[PDB]
Amino acid sequence: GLLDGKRILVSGIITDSSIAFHIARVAQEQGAQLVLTGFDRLRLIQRITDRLPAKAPLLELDVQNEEHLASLAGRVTEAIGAGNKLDGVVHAIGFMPQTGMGINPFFDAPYADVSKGIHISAYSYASMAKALLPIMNPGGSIVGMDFDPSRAMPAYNWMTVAKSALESVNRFVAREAGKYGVRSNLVAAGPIEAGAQIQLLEEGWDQRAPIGWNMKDATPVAKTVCALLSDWLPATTGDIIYADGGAHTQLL
Amino acid sequence: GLLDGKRILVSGIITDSSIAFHIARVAQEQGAQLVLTGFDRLRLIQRITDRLPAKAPLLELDVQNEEHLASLAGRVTEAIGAGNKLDGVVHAIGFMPQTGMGINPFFDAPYADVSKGIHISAYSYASMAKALLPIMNPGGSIVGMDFDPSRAMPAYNWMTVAKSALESVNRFVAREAGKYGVRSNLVAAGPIREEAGAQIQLLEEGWDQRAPIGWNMKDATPVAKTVCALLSDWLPATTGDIIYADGGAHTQLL
Amino acid sequence: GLLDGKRILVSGIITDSSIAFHIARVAQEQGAQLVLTGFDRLRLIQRITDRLPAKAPLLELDVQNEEHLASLAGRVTEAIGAGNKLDGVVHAIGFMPQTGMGINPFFDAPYADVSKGIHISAYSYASMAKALLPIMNPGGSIVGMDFDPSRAMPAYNWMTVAKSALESVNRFVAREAGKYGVRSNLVAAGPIRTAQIQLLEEGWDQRAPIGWNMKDATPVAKTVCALLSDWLPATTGDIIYADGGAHTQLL
Amino acid sequence: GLLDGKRILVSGIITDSSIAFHIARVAQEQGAQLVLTGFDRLRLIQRITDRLPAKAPLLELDVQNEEHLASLAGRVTEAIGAGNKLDGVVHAIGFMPQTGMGINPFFDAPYADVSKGIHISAYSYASMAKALLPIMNPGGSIVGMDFDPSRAMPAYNWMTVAKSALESVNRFVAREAGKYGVRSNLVAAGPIRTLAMSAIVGGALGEEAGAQIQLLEEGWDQRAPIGWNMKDATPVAKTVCALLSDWLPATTGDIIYADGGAHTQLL
């Protein structure tokens, strides 16, 4: 019972193979009471989140919608109880149009597309924190998903730029969260005619990781998120935890 | 004559108190032939660029207009000569609305404002490179201006996020520029000249104190010389990198 | 029961205010079976380890002593059982002569002193890992103690050089540990109390978004225990910062 | 010239092909007056330094010898002139016994060997700075040679640990040098094909070691946006000279990467 009696909001569940689905699954197994967030296909999300070990209320949240954000805190409290507060927040939201990641050349991505990607992947981490910090308990934890953007790589393109922005956003969210006695951290996960480029990237990851890396298994990264949601990392804030097999510490 | 016979495009001159003004001044002193770019007040910018040691053609460039960027290659070539190409490109444009930096709380900056800031301060480094790489010579150099965003600090707020984005953009611009035999680097400068006033005072005082060789905020010439060192042939194996012209303050805790 | 049924070797307990004592205390509370290591004042150390919630065998280990190394693991297996193996290793060993840190100028530290410091503070992480990896279970964890050496600072001097070496040693220990299915990580702690030393120690509290209490070693001990658990299984050759987030903030 | 009228101390010239030789060659071409340092094979180094474009005095310096360090400054001043001071120092000294790098397992390197390596590769950067800072002019520059140790890699082993120690030493040397108005920086070079490096590619260390280093060198050129030529030391020599010049005056305690941009690229 690592997360026993903790109220945790989990965003980004779209499929049963989503890291957010495994974070929610592992958190419930560890005794956490969950609140879930869905963006567009809510009835589809409801049917995915029915396969979770325990029942949890599903709330609508389009992170680009100002009204959804301004009402989020009220809707969460109605779902957990008038006098109850959140102990954790999981930001597992990421988006970049295909012009900004994949086959499309880096220079050919229009700003409107990259901006939408930065809005959803980086700015929204601050939006969700602004909306939920007033309904969070001291000793609380905000966890976001990152993909190590310290070095450029093919096909990830503008999504790497959005993750660099996200890391910087996290350092500032930590400053704001600190006032509430809440921690804010990121988990940098390993990977979970541009098909050849991503194959090269995935093969290289397992090769570099001293303990190896299984791309078809999201549970080691879900456990890391849960470790950050627990009271077992209480002096860690504005930081990045690498759940990538230790591949970022190895050149070859 | 560090930059002797080099054709260099310099963006971001609006006043003579700018780093872009000193980069242009130092580059001309080192024998570089310049092409200059201005945003809106071209009449006032032409008056400012007259304070530069030598004459240089002025071209209008609003980095948010895809019409100006598409034209750039054609406009720069007619200013330097039909058969001549650029040897250097200086990106010295940076903007963030006051909602994104200063006194305004970090959470109170609307996305439209932060997006405009990221567009001008980060995305435009890729826009300018896309437009100018086809008219650049091998051994060429693209330089951008940065402010170390690795750690959060007061007031800088969303400009720190835009600079983090710029660093990432630079690593990708290096990949594209490499195909032309062109280098792409950023120069991370130290600070250049009631609560907000006290915070910035603390940041500037701390910089000089941390810097092993000290830091003079009223002097932009050590950072302009660093940009010129990157525009030269003296750093030929450096790309996708950040050169710190901050007195060594980023390597020191206290 | 975060560490339930885990056999963990803990080094560096010399006092009741040491991080190593609190790691051992927290680990026992979480259901871990411990093996302890002592360097010199082993009679005094035994009287300190009696203040631990549960009984644990104390073994002699001078990290500069070649015979103590290589005899270590055989002595561990006799203490835990012939068929039992270790699940965790805590390296909480650090030393630098006063010529290498404090008031003495950086240039005035002789190599013999800095070398002794690097031997005990950095090289010994590889020595302890070499000796204990053959008696470690897959899913195992090796944890070392670090103090962020990425930037120079007053007084820390050659100890900063030894921690930079330690960080590099840990990336290589991870490569070796990986073939046993064992993780190797460092915990970079904020200042822990035991003018120039005072000024630095107060900066951390102001920079840390959640603040920093130098008189409390329990948040750093819990971080070590989180690394010893199965809750960070994809983390290796890494550094976890338990400094209140101070390293992510300029001011 | 870039270095016109500058007095520069250059250490580590042992072969007519090494980085220290090209630094010295490029510096002399740029108008620098040099002072050279030699380890043991003095008469051999003297005829290797005769290949340099201009004549330069050669001084004996065993970096592990306390007496050689204590007399250093006096010997340099006698070679340049009683009233003249040094404008630059180039530390191009690096050593690690084969127990600490190559085929030998990481855990099998004895401390005495790794310590000798750290003494020569890292500690000596501070030793040379201590000895030469009192005879250095303000605006001066100290440059050391590095190989990016931020990530572990095959064969480099304890030399990576010595290199990590060197970067930390450099940040503290910058603090000391700052008092004299002198900068201290490291140049992190990409892989350079030295006499030993060619031999390991040929298979002097075996098939496995030969394959590992080939993988490391091939990967470097592939990662480098502008490519990487291991047989050419001149781009790294020019970077050292850029740091010795007045064109990077606000850079200290830092690392300049002359590795083709490889360290900024994952793939």
Ligand SMILES: NC(=O)c1ccc[n+]([C@@H]2O[C@H](COP(=O)([O-])OP(=O)(O)OC[C@H]3O[C@@H](n4cnc5c(N)ncnc54)[C@H](O)[C@@H]3O)[C@@H](O)[C@H]2O)c1
């Ligand atoms: N898959 C990997 O290899 C990997 C590696 C590291 C990090 N990550 C990160 O993990 C997170 C989860 O992504 P994933 O890869 O598991 O895939 P995913 O498809 O499961 O998650 C992305 C989610 O973003 C949500 N989203 C998109 N636009 C939104 C909007 N406007 N409002 C609210 N939510 C919106 C979608 O509903 C979706 O659930 C992302 O931040 C991603 O960048 C993934």
Ligand SMILES: NC(=O)c1ccc[n+]([C@@H]2O[C@H](COP(=O)([O-])OP(=O)(O)OC[C@H]3O[C@@H](n4cnc5c(N)ncnc54)[C@H](O)[C@@H]3O)[C@@H](O)[C@H]2O)c1
């Ligand atoms: N001031 C400091 O303390 C400091 C420190 C480190 C780095 N820098 C950097 O130095 C660089 C030079 O700027 P500065 O310090 O002179 O400040 P600045 O306020 O003068 O920069 C604004 C510049 O951007 C241009 N610009 C704005 N919007 C534009 C648009 N849409 N299209 C095209 N051009 C546009 C303006 O014409 C102007 O030249 C900046 O990138 C800044 O971030 C400054």
Ligand SMILES: NC(=O)c1ccc[n+]([C@@H]2O[C@H](COP(=O)([O-])OP(=O)(O)OC[C@H]3O[C@@H](n4cnc5c(N)ncnc54)[C@H](O)[C@@H]3O)[C@@H](O)[C@H]2O)c1
């Ligand atoms: N104290 C702090 O503020 C702080 C901050 C960050 C990191 N750390 C690190 O944490 C570790 C332990 O810290 P602590 O608070 O317990 O202090 P400590 O004084 O108890 O740690 C030093 C230990 O080294 C041991 N030791 C010395 N020489 C030895 C040898 N030859 N063989 C074996 N052991 C030997 C001693 O027995 C002693 O317990 C150290 O490595 C230290 O650098 C401490």
Ligand SMILES: CC(C)[C@H]1OC(=O)[C@H](C)[C@H](O)[C@H](Cc2cccnc2)NC(=O)[C@@H](NC(=O)c2ncccc2O)[C@@H](C)OC1=O
């Ligand atoms: C056997 C094997 C480990 C081999 O490894 C390599 O060649 C690596 C992959 C790489 O190519 C770097 C590239 C380089 C060369 C020079 C400087 N910095 C980086 N080589 C070095 O680091 C080499 N160093 C020195 O010659 C040296 N000389 C002067 C000052 C410090 C010094 O460390 C040695 C230590 O290395 C080897 O022989």
